[PDB]
Amino acid sequence: KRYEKLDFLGEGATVYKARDKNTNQIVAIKKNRTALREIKLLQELSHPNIIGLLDAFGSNISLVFDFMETDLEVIIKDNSLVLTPSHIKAYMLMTLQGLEYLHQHRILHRDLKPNNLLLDENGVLKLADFGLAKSFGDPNRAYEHQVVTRWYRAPELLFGARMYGVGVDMWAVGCILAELLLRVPFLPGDSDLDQLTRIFETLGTPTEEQWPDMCSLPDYVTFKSFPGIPLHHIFSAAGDDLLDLIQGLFLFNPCARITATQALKMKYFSNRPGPTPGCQLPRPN
């Protein structure tokens, strides 16, 4: 009644474009117990790189956010675009500044993947779809457990961990970074077992030194030994500063794995070339 419905945008939920009658501004309208958890976590937060919940109303519920023009998946899949090292540095910087904020507020995203990083027409990247986000402390049930799509999913979750932390988001950011570099999914498992296969044959089956607790995980099972592939072989364009960020994000021990803040202090972010101005980031038609 306050927002002029315009164009359909998705079905998961159900999203629509709309024009607010008061300000005339363009927004996106998204239309349960976790529905309130979502509004709870979001009405709180304010960060340029986190989508901004502008309004809500009941009677299925309707979340009003700012319109976004595109997302990393679209960009990644757009052959017309060539991503430069500066482009990639920019996307990551914004992604990690948003994730550092979330984590400082003891929140896990738990569903980080390229289509959940949205971009506005000024090249501001924003984390979105907090339908799985939870406060760090909240417990994980066995049969209600919500887990990212398997290609971005961290090894501890594939081994059925119920106690976990930021490393689950940091792994997903590693898989996103790899996808920006290769322009295809990094680790495209065709099953949860095959997702681990792929992880180990790419990165090496973990030693006990690399991952002390691994064997005590609930769904731990014995895979063959794979040596893995050197990252400079996988990512042949990447400088040494980037290689070290990647390696940091893909450490098997979830407690050794690099945090958003540790990532952000990495030489990579202070080295030339600098991150593209948002207004210069590549745009699809």
Ligand SMILES: CC(C)c1cnn2c(NCc3ccccc3)cc(NC[C@H]3CCNC[C@@H]3O)nc12
């Ligand atoms: C609900 C809010 C976060 C939002 C703002 N703009 N916008 C657009 N904009 C158009 C668009 C087209 C292509 C790629 C991305 C966005 C599409 C869209 N689609 C719904 C889901 C789809 C899966 N990824 C998260 C999206 O919010 N949701 C939204």
